Amino acid sequence: DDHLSIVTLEEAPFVIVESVDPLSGTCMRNTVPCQKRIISENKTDEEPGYIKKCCKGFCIDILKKISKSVKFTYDLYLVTNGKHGKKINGTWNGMIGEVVMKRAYMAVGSLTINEERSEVVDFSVPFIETGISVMVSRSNGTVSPSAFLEPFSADVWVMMFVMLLIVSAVAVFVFEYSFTIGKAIWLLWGLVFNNSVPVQNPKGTTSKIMVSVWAFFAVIFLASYTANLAAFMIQEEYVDQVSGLSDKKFQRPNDFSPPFRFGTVPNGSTERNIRNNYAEMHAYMGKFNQRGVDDALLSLKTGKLDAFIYDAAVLNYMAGRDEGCKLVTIGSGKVFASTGYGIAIQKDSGWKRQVDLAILQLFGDGEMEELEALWLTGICHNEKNEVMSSQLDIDNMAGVFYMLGAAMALSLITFICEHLF
Amino acid sequence: DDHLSIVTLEEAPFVIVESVDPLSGTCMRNTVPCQKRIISENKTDEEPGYIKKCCKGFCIDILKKISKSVKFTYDLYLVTNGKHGKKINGTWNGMIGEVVMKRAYMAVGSLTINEERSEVVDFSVPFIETGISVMVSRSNGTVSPSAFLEPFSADVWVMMFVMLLIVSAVAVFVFEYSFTIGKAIWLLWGLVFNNSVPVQNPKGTTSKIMVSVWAFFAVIFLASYTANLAAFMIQEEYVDQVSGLSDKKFQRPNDFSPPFRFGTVPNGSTERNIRNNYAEMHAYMGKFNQRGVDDALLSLKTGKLDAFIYDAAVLNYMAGRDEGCKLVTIGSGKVFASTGYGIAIQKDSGWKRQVDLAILQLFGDGEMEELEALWLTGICHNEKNEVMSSQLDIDNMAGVFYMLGAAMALSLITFICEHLF
Amino acid sequence: TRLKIVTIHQEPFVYVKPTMSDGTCKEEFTVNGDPVKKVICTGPNDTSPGSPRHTVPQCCYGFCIDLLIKLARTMQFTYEVHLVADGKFGTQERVQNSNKKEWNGMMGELLSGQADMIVAPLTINNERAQYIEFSKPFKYQGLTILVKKEIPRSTLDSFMQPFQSTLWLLVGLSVHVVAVMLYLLDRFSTLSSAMWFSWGVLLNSGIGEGAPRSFSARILGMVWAGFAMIIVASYTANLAAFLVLDRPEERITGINDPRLRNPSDKFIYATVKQSSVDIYFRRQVELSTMYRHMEKHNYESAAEAIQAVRDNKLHAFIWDSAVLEFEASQKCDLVTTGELFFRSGFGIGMRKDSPWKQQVSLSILKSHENGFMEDLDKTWVRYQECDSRSNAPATLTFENMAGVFMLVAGGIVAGIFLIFIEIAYK
Amino acid sequence: TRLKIVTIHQEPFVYVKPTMSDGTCKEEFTVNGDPVKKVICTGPNDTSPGSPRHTVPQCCYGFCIDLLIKLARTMQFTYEVHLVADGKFGTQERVQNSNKKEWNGMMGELLSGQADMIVAPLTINNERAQYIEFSKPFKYQGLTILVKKEIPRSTLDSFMQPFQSTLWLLVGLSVHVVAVMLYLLDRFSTLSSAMWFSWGVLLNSGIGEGAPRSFSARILGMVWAGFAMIIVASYTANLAAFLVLDRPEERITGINDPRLRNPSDKFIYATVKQSSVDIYFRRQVELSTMYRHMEKHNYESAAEAIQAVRDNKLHAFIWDSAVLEFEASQKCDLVTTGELFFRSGFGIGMRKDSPWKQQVSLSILKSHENGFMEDLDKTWVRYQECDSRSNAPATLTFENMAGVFMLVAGGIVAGIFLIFIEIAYK
Ligand SMILES: CCCCCCCC/C=C/CCCCCCCC(=O)O[C@@H](COC(=O)CCCCCCCCCCCCCCC)COP(=O)([O-])OCC[N+](C)(C)C
Ligand SMILES: CCCCCCCC/C=C/CCCCCCCC(=O)O[C@@H](COC(=O)CCCCCCCCCCCCCCC)COP(=O)([O-])OCC[N+](C)(C)C
Ligand SMILES: C#Cc1sc2ncn(CC(=O)N3CC(C)(F)C3)c(=O)c2c1-c1ccc(F)c(Br)c1
Ligand SMILES: C#Cc1sc2ncn(CC(=O)N3CC(C)(F)C3)c(=O)c2c1-c1ccc(F)c(Br)c1
Ligand SMILES: C#Cc1sc2ncn(CC(=O)N3CC(C)(F)C3)c(=O)c2c1-c1ccc(F)c(Br)c1
Ligand SMILES: C#Cc1sc2ncn(CC(=O)N3CC(C)(F)C3)c(=O)c2c1-c1ccc(F)c(Br)c1
Ligand SMILES: CC(C)CCC[C@@H](C)[C@H]1CC[C@H]2[C@@H]3CC=C4C[C@@H](O)CC[C@]4(C)[C@H]3CC[C@]12C
Ligand SMILES: CC(C)CCC[C@@H](C)[C@H]1CC[C@H]2[C@@H]3CC=C4C[C@@H](O)CC[C@]4(C)[C@H]3CC[C@]12C
Known part of the structure; x- marks a missing residue:
């Protein structure tokens, strides 16, 4: 028979559950209902709740179209014992607990493909990339102090001053054939910076021609300096908090400033991988684990937790759905372990080929790339660079005061150098 | 039985026909077959061709999902006697010629709903708005001569030159208690326009304070004048060639400059409406009619024809798919007669209700608004405003030369007014 | 009959x-x-x-x-x-x-x-x-979106805005410090004519022709000219970036915005209760998720909904184009944006x-x-009282340049006091 | 084994x-x-x-x-x-x-x-x-698009670009006309010191302290100051609009592009013959229409396709992200844009x-x-030789400001001739 059950877990946008309509009593249109069991009657096991839910998402719709692809009906129900699955005491739990104990024959959800979960339960072709990701409230903002020199590169600035030296040293050549070099530097330079200052102009007719062909250069200099200026004085270079998993901070949390509060959700594949690859990290991070992703988000916003490690796809989804773009994954979406969301199957079953072809037909005809944007998209998904419509504080405009202070001190250095020599 | 034939006309993006694959010999995937009637063997009628055509598009996809909605199969064939339909000599032609002679029982294509076509053949709910539209090679480019005064309105300019008189008439008050008003106007005004000119500064200490609190105003004036400046000097106001159908040009083509070359495709609903509503226009435009829309586009680009009138939707499609945005409908997509593309049905048939309710779920669920962008979208359909990255010719910067010439003449007027008085 | x-x-x-x-x-x-x-x-x-x-x-x-x-x-x-x-x-x-x-x-x-x-x-x-x-x-016609546009959130209500008020002070304090060092580096190698160079280099008023004499103070005067140029050019460029804000943020383009997918505290939008748009919202597959949001924001009629859009009570409204377009033509504060979805007449x-x-x-x-x-x-709806100001830089009205007039005016009224002070000084 | x-x-x-x-x-x-x-x-x-x-x-x-x-x-x-x-x-x-x-x-x-x-x-x-x-x-990985970016078509190869060459002449001719009227309106109510006011008001060189004396010529000098400001401010604002060409970073955004739907003479794009992208082109419902186009532009291998993209032979290329991203990291002339469609590893x-x-x-x-x-x-692909700060304003290198250097240099070499002429003049 083609009728086979489907089991899932209420979590992530892939599995979002909705209740029944008060007036209709049924799920909405194009909705396959769901099933769940409840435990009551004190110590004994009571009858199941048999509340029929409406649980859908980016995986459930794929289940719909593969159901029409292979022409099979099904029903949906949820795991009650366990969430993801751990081979605790040699017994699988959650998703794998259901699959190895049969009575499911299928499993659709955010189940991570890995060797441990595959040795007993083979997986189909993954339909979306995922893995491990670290997301933090990585947001400081550091305007580079030399943002007022950025409009030109150092090569151009230095060539500007060597020209100002070799033009003022000829305008006291085209003018000797009381206007010395000390006043041609002070003229030729007061034209570059608008024409604010009081200068002492030449008097020969061929030297005013040179001051003019230099004032045109000043006009182009200030036209091409100030072209981008209020976008260089507002451009903040955010510094990422943690370079990666293998950084010196995570290796030795203790020998630094008070260690980063980083954790995960225990009894999951993310903790499963980290305990194997980094047991020393696992020993410390066991104390910072939290029940769910919502708890992690609240902890990060409140500041008690300052880093979170979890599945890549879910964290990527939660990044774009935040009040502001404060929370962002480390590495601009960097994944330290590439896996995929597969469909759990019983070993040596002929449905695997059908499922693989049904999944790949979506890649081929490209009818789910629009489904990618239908749900997994947020406001923060398109950051508006670092420039905005913001005032200029003293934080922004403080490479000009450093230069003014540096000359405020070099003038005194050369003052004493005069008064002794 | 539910099997009813479908007829169509090869026209517009709704009906685009492709041949069979040389290696496969059949239509592509998801392509309903099409048939077209052929005539040969000199005067007599030859044997049937039975060519395997693949006619698809927007209306064809609408037909596909309405056929899946109502669960009926069909076949597609093309009209050869007539294209759209004219009740010539009391006999219907084309689409209506087929429908009144049955052998199709249905009609999907670029068919316009109107009373004459509806009195004999009822139409379903239209799936897209359309009608009559005039498209021309609308182009020119008129940079307004006073684009150098547009950064501020007239209130602000006049109040600037009233404040300048007020300030210069007090800086020779805060300065009495050789610097007369003639030099406070020439100072207070040489600061507004950068500080290029040679001025004669005051000498009292409380008058330099006024010149300074005015130089700060000059700094804000030139910061807010030049903020948008190179977008006002480049902003071209295109003038539409024809206001509308009922303009004095179309009413009396002859009593003007050589009359506009405007025509259509004869034997169609567009000419059908115009001969009724404006027969005087029809008499003149009969000589400028052309065989097909491609001929119209080529004629407009070559310039022999300088206006085209046709169905709204087709012209809107062709506007966005041109080399450049030279061709565009008059009125920015204005339609002078609102109609819709309906489906031609035999009168007193129960399929009309089914067809209406099978078209309307496309509106309700919104699964064809994406179909709207799937085919009917062009590059010029989005445009890039009137500002670009373009040099400034004289045409752009010729409101500054008009002002310079006008002062070049007012100075001489006041020169002779001195030399006489 | x-x-x-x-x-x-x-x-x-x-x-x-x-x-x-x-x-x-x-x-x-x-x-x-x-x-x-x-x-x-x-x-x-x-x-x-x-x-x-x-x-x-x-x-x-x-x-x-x-x-x-x-x-x-x-x-x-x-x-x-x-x-x-x-x-x-x-x-x-x-x-x-x-x-x-x-x-x-x-x-x-x-x-x-x-x-x-x-x-x-x-x-x-x-x-x-x-x-x-x-x-x-x-x-x-088709459904369209009317935005508030009452405040584009880039409104120069002051010309002191381009700089923040602990930079105006530190520019207006760094003038006196550099003046009282031009004077001292010149004296020991005048004060009024140093304090005048110091200002009239900033404002570009070209007033005060005293130039620093001694080689120590010409370096500091040169660098103060450079500082004055960068300060004034940053004010100018930042004022422009405030005015050239003719492209206001991100406008909603049809029913495509991710912010429409997910309800948020800032963004609120709704339609008329028991209307065609409600049926469309419940009739769209993805639109059942945020159906919770506008259910508490839906208005009884479109008139008060548009009134809310005009004020700071509703941000985006959805309704038939033949209505929202007319309302946007009658009032300049409200405009519509986004492609016309649900092209149902x-x-x-x-x-x-x-x-x-x-x-x-x-x-x-x-x-x-x-x-x-x-x-x-x-006859009925063709007034077009507004203009296609989009893709067209705006013109700075009065009341959009009133502050500079008040600046020069206040300079006059302060000068009539300063002149009494100066005559009394001697 | x-x-x-x-x-x-x-x-x-x-x-x-x-x-x-x-x-x-x-x-x-x-x-x-x-x-x-x-x-x-x-x-x-x-x-x-x-x-x-x-x-x-x-x-x-x-x-x-x-x-x-x-x-x-x-x-x-x-x-x-x-x-x-x-x-x-x-x-x-x-x-x-x-x-x-x-x-x-x-x-x-x-x-x-x-x-x-x-x-x-x-x-x-x-x-x-x-x-x-x-x-x-x-x-x-998923398919991505690599653009040419060799010429963004807003390349200042001269500083005379912001104005067109029949406006440079008419600005440099309208200087002498206004000079020879300042001189005449003053004479009949000097010529060198009128011709010096006329220029040193344009360039803002502040050279030549002669100011028009007579009331007729002060009106013309005032309006010539206004003309000089508007001319120079238009040069400046138009140079900026040439240099602030950060917008051309907006290019083809994924498969969803109207210019990809229809072939055109200017726009050409293709992939490798008998490759996955060819199947995806024939596996896509809408992509069969323009499948005629790249059939004549498709390349035998991706190496020469990318070489064509680098030169002015191919504008847009489509290939796996793991390849195009690496190529764009090795060479600054090529960058990729558009969402990663067909996310098939x-x-x-x-x-x-x-x-x-x-x-x-x-x-x-x-x-x-x-x-x-x-x-x-x-180890293999992590070099990141190119800057990833897109939408960051660029820095004007030398060879991107070499013309002004040649301008002042040419002024020197012309001055050593003009000085011979001047000494000979007396
Ligand atoms: C000896 C020679 C003397 C020469 C004297 C020359 C003096 C000429 C200078 C004139 C400019 C001074 C005008 C004063 C107006 C105050 C505005 C205010 O308080 O409101 C603003 C706050 O203001 C701030 O942000 C604080 C600024 C501190 C004073 C600035 C001093 C340094 C100016 C450095 C100048 C460097 C220029 C660089 C070029 C750019 C905010 O506005 P609002 O919130 O809407 O409140 C309305 C304001 N109202 C209450 C007034 C209605
Ligand atoms: C008595 C007192 C005397 C005072 C004298 C002061 C004089 C100071 C002024 C100096 C500026 C003049 C420099 C000349 C350079 C020529 C450039 C050229 O030919 O190439 C360009 C064409 O050029 C044009 O578009 C035509 C311009 C005509 C000459 C301009 C005269 C008016 C300038 C109005 C000035 C108003 C300023 C307003 C502020 C903006 C194009 O470049 P290209 O295609 O890459 O070709 C390379 C060029 N190359 C062959 C040289 C390599
Ligand atoms: C006189 C003089 C010189 S020589 C010089 N040489 C290098 N640079 C820039 C630089 O080193 N870098 C830019 C970077 C941080 F990327 C590396 C300069 O800015 C100057 C100035 C200068 C600059 C602005 C001024 F306002 C003044 Br006065 C002088
Ligand atoms: C002195 C003086 C005055 S008084 C005046 N009054 C009105 N306008 C503008 C105007 O009338 N309109 C703008 C419109 C076309 F929309 C209608 C002015 O430009 C001026 C100038 C002026 C302007 C630029 C100058 F460069 C100089 Br000098 C003077
Ligand atoms: C009292 C008062 C008012 S009412 C007012 N209305 C508008 N604007 C805007 C403006 O003038 N702009 C110049 C621009 C183009 F940059 C924008 C104002 O500035 C003010 C001031 C004001 C503000 C700061 C002040 F310091 C002073 Br005194 C007055
Ligand atoms: C010979 C020669 C060359 S090689 C060259 N390379 C780059 N640039 C750009 C530039 O200098 N810019 C200044 C900016 C920021 F606006 C862009 C040039 O202008 C030139 C000139 C040139 C051009 C016009 C001339 F009139 C002269 Br003389 C020289
Ligand atoms: C103008 C001459 C005489 C002296 C003043 C030098 C001025 C122009 C410039 C030269 C290079 C500049 C520096 C460039 C980079 C940095 C590094 C940053 O961490 C602090 C600011 C600082 C240190 C800038 C201060 C201003 C500075 C020192
Ligand atoms: C400033 C004092 C000295 C007056 C001299 C400038 C006067 C005459 C200037 C200022 C604004 C100028 C006008 C600006 C607008 C227009 C409208 C346009 O369709 C033709 C040019 C024309 C008509 C210009 C003619 C000259 C003008 C009126």
């Missing part, structure tokens, strides 16, 4: 105004000297009658009214107009937890036989077409057994081909 | 180098002092055989090669590598107008038994998965009856969990 007609109030289509004197309103003429035809409307004093439940004989006029009069002369029938009490277009609901479904608004009365003809901008829809048969659309619904479907459809098609309602479009 | 492996040349995955001396290439080390492991490649010289119609021994190295060596030590098998002669990934075609369909490229040999293991960036696909079974993807295909599918899949998953190929990613 005798026909009963229900109508809803819609500003670009149905102008409703309570009658005065005996119960007949004026005969005011249009701009082109044409009379504004009126019809009697025994309509409720206020929407959802309640305590003032009185059928005032108001007068109605507009696009639909002129269409009614044209069909009245063509079809030779008598009619009366009375507004719907609930003031809704119509949706399908149930009461008392019963299997049967009941209609609202127009179909809550037309289906009951209380109304024979429906004349209102009623959008064609599946649930609407199941119970009544619509005629051909007399005006094709209006129409005239008919009863299943009403012997007028074919002939009324032919009548409206005839009105299309002869251009009668094109003239109605030009 | 004995296994035959075919591989294709892909720069970020497969580096191919013809061996010299006896037939082994160098043992060059990486940046971190690690040896670059090599394998023997009996592939055809210069892609197609041509004149060197022989499988010349070569050495291959890269990401896939290191994955091969890891699986070689784990699985304990012998292998040899030889490049595919046709140099294609593989598509399904027919010959001699026969019903049977034949494969080319990798599956033109693996399906024939000539290859046991496939190690190449072969995208997983339906037509590809029907004939062979793919393992788990060892690198998930690579994989290792297997024969239907080959008894290694499960164990090879477990091996690659184990390599994922232990972070071996994360180290491979850092």
